Amino acid sequence: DSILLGLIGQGLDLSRTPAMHEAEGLAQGRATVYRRIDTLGSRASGQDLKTLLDAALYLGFNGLNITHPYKQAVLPLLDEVSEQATQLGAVNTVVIDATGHTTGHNTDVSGFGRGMEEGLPNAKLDSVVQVGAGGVGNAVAYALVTHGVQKLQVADLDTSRAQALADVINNAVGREAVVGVDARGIEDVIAAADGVVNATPMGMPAHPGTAFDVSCLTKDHWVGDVVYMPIETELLKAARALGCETLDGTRMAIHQAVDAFRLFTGLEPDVSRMRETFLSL
Template identity: 55%
Template structure:
């Protein structure tokens, strides 16, 4: 039996990241490539650290020989000031979720939230109509998803958020970045007529998570001509996903984006091409095991 020829050390910085599925997802794929791949959560809440400590943690990781870091809430914006370079897409989004540490110690920030959704969207909903799309949620994840949708070629994007000022701010930024598209902020009161004209619906709010059950809108408004994408993945089968399937819609579950961003991060860290479908299968197995464990309690 041959030993792994290379080793990688990666980590995830954020608040409450100890239960994350990202470490086993990366480690298994590393093993499939013959690597010794260690990935550790760095939970600022468990360590008693403030979000502003992200710069100190990045420097410590560099000094300790880490190859890369994923960055999640609430540090994606804060980390930018502590990096040597930031790629163009992450700079436009104003958020970094992936940091590669080069052999010379320089740090480069990327954003695989948007690229992960884009690859998931293209693979999971090939040929989806891009004329008119409604997106619910204008937070951090919503910004990345909207950027991906417009990159994919969406012609008219309506963003609906419970905080109208946040939606207005996001749409102004996106309209500047994508002048050929129509990007507008709309209110929740306008959702029904928006959905009537829409080709697709993308959901980027916490509704549907285990702690926030339900659907973000009246799903009786869905028809078979709609496609529906959800970014919630705990659980994979949200009520929105179930209702959309029952209505005859083509559906993209939230696990696709979660795996997509991990696939891109693995590639950035190692320079190797991961097997996206294998990582998807492993992710679903992890989710299923998690659900079984929770049910056994």
């Protein structure tokens, strides 16, 4: 039976997610279409999230991903939501069952967590700094503290954003795992930490540079980056030069799709194939 999926969000032209799902469905013998549903684009602009979700239900979609700015807004519209997505307050994956009812999940969390396992298997996790509370920073922080990080300091230009994220995560896990810290002087905090993750767009071609002064890194740090365009960000280059273990941004981006594909289809995805597709774009 053919598989029909889509992604509801804004500014979706460069998403690698549609190609990953289309190729893997086909590799498993199932014709698969995965449509961008971009509310800045030529088809869905100006439509409400509920309209688009309902449309997917009526027209036989088997699942959706959800991205900015709808990952929090979508929760109340869904029939069921996983406890993890419920506690984070964000859903990136919606499974649509035969009768058009919906279950929300968050594979950004599971995907980053898998990335940590795959790419940082020996990393010291006692104390970690995350720079950036926006984008997928919420899922990243949640994954960090549920995959071994004892103390996470989250810095954002907007201190209130970092504190809000800290409160959400701490409530979800039931301990004071996360503390908001000032972005100014974050270098000193990183220097004392075991690892640091960039969750800002810094490093992308339209946001060149690094979110902090990389001279504060030492060889003993590990460094992670959410940015995967480019794969080798200035931050990760600087970390690698020192001999730091690194976690690049492709791992989360691939694994969120691996986990979503499994949820959408009940098939076991081939990670290496989905990684190949991801890198080919």
